[model samples]
Target: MKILFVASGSPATVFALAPLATAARNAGHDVFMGAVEDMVPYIASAGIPALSIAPSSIRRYATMDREGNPVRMPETPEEELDFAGHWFGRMAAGSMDALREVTANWRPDLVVGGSMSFAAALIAAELGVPYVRQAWDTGDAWRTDPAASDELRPELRALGLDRLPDPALFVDICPPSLRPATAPPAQMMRWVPANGQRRLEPWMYTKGNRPRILVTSGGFLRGLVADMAALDAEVVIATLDEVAEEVRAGWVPLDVVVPTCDVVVHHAGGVTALTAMNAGVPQLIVPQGGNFVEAGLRISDFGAAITVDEAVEKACGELIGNPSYAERARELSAEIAALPLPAEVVGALEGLVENLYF
Candidate 1:
């Protein structure tokens, strides 16, 4: 079977591919991957055929008007959704429309991703192909992080929502073994083992046990250096930016980043945190984006890692210096190590595809 694996353009994507790729390859199925232009190189380096979709330039919302000037004001979520979101929808559609043109000569039998969400969902629907949504963090279980819960309210209010989905829907994908305390309904979609098969060298993946502590404060790294320095911990920053000074920092590529790190610190992106968890590394997530609180709450409950609050100076400083963080990390690592490998995921993907397309 030929599989087209669509991934988000981020470090976590590499982890998302692990079990799926290995399972497909071992089963003698052809596997391909793709994402944004900046990420295409990393996908290619993984020895998989890749197709580029979006570019970083596409990330910025049209904060400007037709006159080519900045809007200079915060737009409401509804307004943003109607205007900026519509524009983004068009732009995104244009990118997807290019897919048929670029790969006119070849097509995929199946598509898969870890919460690749909108794009993957849309494309799979368009092509009449099976699209898989993989979950990387603990599923939602009641504003697991109280502070984050406080922040989500206004955003929800802005969107005009008075009610919330029970966090159980969010936590459904988390494995019970790894997340026993979760109140979310216990329904686990199969997860492929996404560890160790990556092309990146181990040391390149992490600091390699120099009492490794992970740093993941999101892509912007607003509080990263300060957080690490605050703890006075000998640390490495595992980010994609060349501008940032990560201990294990290098534009070295994803395959190189996953295997070597003893632990991972991140923004609680679904795929990144899950990858770290699957690799048996302790995780620390400094969430800044929408999913941060949810990821932290779920992962922390499962004993995978600790969550550092926005008060990086205080939260991270205290967490890192305390032995509890390391101890918890070790425990989480053991939990991850005991899970199934990518081969299992490949089987699930193949079965799903067959059921859908056969």
Candidate 2:
């Protein structure tokens, strides 16, 4: 079977599907991945064959104004959801033509996409191919679907689709602890960290006498990590620019460094959060924007995360000092570790393909 995986939003969503795509390939199925040209490198880096179905990036389609200026993202959660819905809707609309051309030329048996990559559903339904969705994050991101429906009215009507087509399989990478109450039913797949890898170093794998914390991106935190230098714990910074000499163990992979750390303070991204959780490290989410704050609340409600405000020092201190955070994080780590591995999940997709009556 030819399985085609597509993502038009963030590279992270494409990363989320790498494990499953790899599993399908390892099982001897022909698999291909598609994305905007800008994201093709990320897909290729994961050892997946990639097709550049669209010329422009999702950022250009979704975030730019008519004059090519950046637009401010919505401030409130409801508006944010609406913004996201239309954002993906526009992405689907923009990419649909190239997507149709790719599908027609390649003739896939199954089509898989990130939760927000609406074009995949449209093309799958149009082509009568089985569709699959991989959850991009732990939050209830589906709330954006309606806005996408409204925005894609012309595209859907062209295909005679009333709304987004339901996936034959929706693979949820989020562990049970972080699953939202209203999440759609999905096949649970373990969160596999397929981000960049490098030769492991001593600082990457070992902890010092001081408690360790990994803080991602100095720009997101706005000197918060520098503020952390006064604390007794060892501070590791993941950033591009120069930092204070004491805290510059830079660019360590989250999966590698997280296990050696007691806590992580990050930009509230799904990969970082899940990587930290899978390593049983407590986290503080200093969310810059988007559904991250809301997603952080879910983890916070689960007792393993703190939705931190600018009070970074206080939050990190508590995440480090408290014992319950690590306890809960460990429980979640166990849950993540127990979920079906991606290789095991290839059979589920095979089952879907084999059982297809049409």
Candidate 3:
């Protein structure tokens, strides 16, 4: 069966396709990742064929108004949903025709898209094919749908639709128990991390006797670099970003090394949060944006993680000194490990399409 995978333009969520898309390709299914212009390279980096369906990236649209003026990203929880709703809607409108054209010529039997890749939802509806919505994690949990719906009114009206059709399947990657109680019924798949395929050294995956902390952030590191270095633990930064000369923290990929860490400090983006969750590492989230903040809350509520409070040093000490946090994290890892592997999920999708064709 020919399957089209849609990626959101945000770099953070782009690799959300990695485990499943790679599974489809390796299973000998015809699989291709379709995304906006900038993400083509990253998608293809994973060795899957990629198709560019839009000229602009999510960052380009995120920083600009519909009228083409630059704007600040929304900071408040309530405003961020509306903010993403409008931008994601604009992205869908801009890319819909191109995606429709892609499917017109390529004609996928199935379309799977990241939760924010609204264009995929439309393309599937137009083609009368099964549409799958891949969950980003359990944090925001479909909260942006109303705002996206409001913004897509023009496109919906053009299609003679009062509302977009609901997805045929919701593919959830969140550990089942950690998923919100109000979440929709789902086809569960375990989260498998695929990060930059950097050549690894033994030091990267194995830690010393001291408690090890993995610290990284997409925004507002504040004073964490210094705090992490001063703590009585082996420390590593998850990014290749410039660092202070005095700090001796190592650099490593989140997917490869997070599991070996005692505590993970990060911005709590979808994949970043997912990596730590999958590793069963207790987290200290320095939440900033709408998605980041929500994820921080969910993980903290699950008792596996916490948002940074009064001080980063004190928090790190608590996470290391406390055994309960690590226990909860271990429970989450067990839940994730027990979910169906992506290859099995691939078989289920193939069966679904086979039944459709039959």
Candidate 4:
């Protein structure tokens, strides 16, 4: 079988889809990744073949206004969803021409994409191929307003598509503990950390006497480095180059560092949140807006996470000192580990294809 995985958002989106791509390839299926140009390095670093489908929008989205603040979603749910529609719709529109070229050159039997990778569904609809969606985390955002689909209708018609096809499968990697009760049903898959292109350091496998916490923030949340420097524990900062001498600065693959940490302080990104959960490390999520705050709140319900407001260091202290948080985190970790592995999902995917087209 020939499978194409499309990732048009952030590097986190690509990382989320890597395990499934790895699974498909190891199962003897030909796999290719179609992503934005900026993300090609990440895809290739993960050892997957990549086709750059479009120039990146990450910079445009990340561009600061005259006030020196990055663009942010509106506070209201309706407006936020509308903003999401516009954001994702633009990505879909930009990728259409390139996606057409790729589908024409190398047809795919199946198409799998991240929740935000609307282009995959668009192209799959055009080509009449089965499409699957893989969520980066507990998938609440995946259940967008139907109006979001309406945003793409014009473009869909341009490509001879009336509407986007409902996914043949929605692969959910969120642990049941962290997922909202209202989230739609999906195929449960274990969260496998694929922190692209980093070697394992021997020290990462070992634990120190004091609580070891991994403090990581994306480029957008560089403020976290300063906020976390006040913590007295052993802190490993990821990505931010300069930090307090008390803080350790380096990048090891998340899979390597997450398990070694007693707790994690991060920006509450889907990839980091899920990776920490998979490693059974309690998290202090200082969300930098978006659905991250909502995800952090949900994880807090499971006793595995704390959403920070003012007391950042206090939250980290509690997460490291409190036994209950670690216990709940480990319990959730067990639940995640028990979910079906990526390799286990290959048969079901094959069966879905057979059921749909055979």
Candidate 5:
């Protein structure tokens, strides 16, 4: 089986799909990754064949326009759908040609994409290949919302597409306990932690007497240093280099550091939240917007986390001192462990492909 894995340029998106790529390859199936140029190296590092689909210069969905004007974010839910639709359409427009060209030559039997990669869905629809969506966050229930698709009409027409193809399978990595009750059901897969290759830091093994707290803003670490500094625990800032003086600024893979820490405060990215859950550590989420907010909500709903509002420091303190939070987190960890492994899903994927194509 030839499986083509497609995702946006973000490292988190690539990480979310890496386990499946490895599983497919180990199962004696051919695997190829279609990603932006910046992400090609990371995909290759995972030993998967990588085909560069587009560069950052082209796939500017949430940033400035061609005229150098900043794009405004959506205000209401209705507007949010429009904003997402147009942005996803533009993203598809930028990368669809390369994706189409590559698939035309290589001819993958199954097309699998990150939840947000609309271009993959468009191409699969055009080529009549089966499509699968592997979600990176809890908000995937909204992916099929008609309001967003209605907004894609212009871009769809431009690409000679009538509608986006519904994924034959939608994979969710969040444990059933943490998954939002209102979210659509999916093929739940265990989130195997893949944060790329990393060298073990000395601090990872060295345990301090003080409670340890790790803070990361995911990729957007701006203006968070001061708040992190105020926290009383022995602090480690994982992603923000600017706060080196205020706290210990360094890079340690979440899989390593999360288990060592008593609590984690983060931007509530899908992968990071799951990483914390897998480690059984309490999380304090500072939600920015969109799916970040939803991810935070799901974690809090599961009793493993709390959202930062006016009481950021207080929340952090409570997360560490409170036994209930850590108890819930451990429960979630067990739930995640019980979910189907990536290797187990490969046979099911093969069955789906055979039924569709054979």
Candidate 6:
């Protein structure tokens, strides 16, 4: 069987799908992947063949401050509407063309994509193949009026798709703790271990001790670095910048910041939080806009996360210093450590493919 996997520009796509790619190849299937050009090395290094997708509106904006801090801001309705006006049609058309090209050329038996590449689904429909959606987080954002109309209007209009995704199209391919909820267009299942969170013997040495944390502001929380610096906990910051000075001056990890840390304070972006959660550390989401606190509340309900306003560093310090926060994190970590492994993820994909052609 031949498979084509589509991905977003973020590193999350690589980490999340690495295991599945390996599994498919190991099973003797021909696997090729598509992502932004920069992601080529990341995908190919793992022994998967990869192609490039030029994003219509992809831009590497100044997400971080000069001091490498994550920043926060409120939602801008005006900006949202303007964005809809500018990029919708081109994105749909380009996406359609790319998907069509990959399928028509590769002749893949299955099409798999992460969230940002729903165009894979459109192509699958065009070719009369089953589309498999692998999701890592929760939320029916497709159900939201503004987001749906703004991001997907062209696909909806051109392909006759509704704003909401079809339930049959998606395959929930994350751990139960990570995904947490199910709805229309979503099915609950256990999958193999993927993502950056890995198991190791060293974990036992730190299990009962040290308040561990994963600190990342995500792509959008670049300015929140200052606020994170002000926090009290030892942090392991994963950034795409030269953060050595900041780590030495304030947090942990003078070079990379992943080896030792406690409590990851970051934006509620998908995989960073998931990796930290898998590490058994609690999470704090300083969301980007109005939705920041909302995401915080939802994750906190699982007893593994809390919300910190990026605007309130002083208040954030108070929460970080609290013993209750550390306790909640340890409990959450325990749950994460106990979830399914990578093989489960592969099995789920296998099941999907089997049923796909049946």
User: TM-scores of the models, in the given order?
Assistant: 0.62, 0.89, 0.88, 0.87, 0.85, 0.67
Candidate 1 lDDT over residue span 1-358, tens digit each: 8776666535456555645665676689877766767777756655567677777565553455323566454365334324433333333443565565554556777666544223554555556676665554434322222322232344334435442212211212455555546443432443433333334554554453234455543332445555555445445554456547525553433334544554566666766666565455556666654444555676676655667655544545444456665566566656555555556556556666555355
TM-score of 5: 0.85
Per-prediction CA RMSD (Å): 8.5, 3.1, 3.0, 4.4, 3.8, 7.7
Whole-model lDDT values for every prediction: 0.52, 0.78, 0.76, 0.76, 0.75, 0.54
Residue pairs with clashing backbones, model 4: none
Model 1: CA > 4 A from native: 8-11, 61-92, 137-173, 177-210, 216-233, 239-265, 269-272, 279-281, 301-304, 310-324, 353-358
Give lDDT for model 5.
0.75
Instruction: Give the alpha carbon lDDT tens digit for every residue of 1-358 in model 5.
Output: 8898997747778888988888999899999988889889878877888889988776566665434678797788667765666565566667878987888788888888887777777777777778888884435646443543554666567657666656888888867765556877678888787546667778886777778888875332333334445554577777644545445776667777778898888776666777888788999898775355676787798788998764666787788888999999999888888988999888778877655455
Flag clash pairs in model 2. Answer: none
Question: Candidate 6 local accuracy as lDDT?
Answer: 0.54
- Ranked by TM-score, top first: 2, 3, 4, 5, 6, 1
**Candidate 2, 1-60: lDDT as tens digits:** 999888867666777778898889878999998998888988887788989877765567
Extract clashing residue pairs from model 3: none
Q: Tell me the tens digit of each residue's lDDT in model 4 across 1-358.
A: 9899999677778888999898898899999998889899888888788899988753364333323466575678766766676567666767879888987888999899988788888888888878888874535554452544676778778777666667888898877766767777788899686546655677778887766878775442345445545554567777644443326676657788888898887776767787887888899887775445676777888898888775776777688878999999999888888999999988778877675455
lDDT of candidate 6 over 54-101, digit per residue (tens): 552443212322234542332575554344322322343355656677
> lDDT tens digits, residues 202-285, model 3?
877787787787777433344655565555567776554465333234456677778778998777676668887888889887
Model 2 alpha-carbon drift over 4 Å, by segment = 63-75, 136-142, 218-231, 241-246, 355-358
Q: What's the CA error at residue 187 for candidate 6, in Å?
A: 4.4
Ranking the candidates on lDDT from highest down gives 2, 3, 4, 5, 6, 1
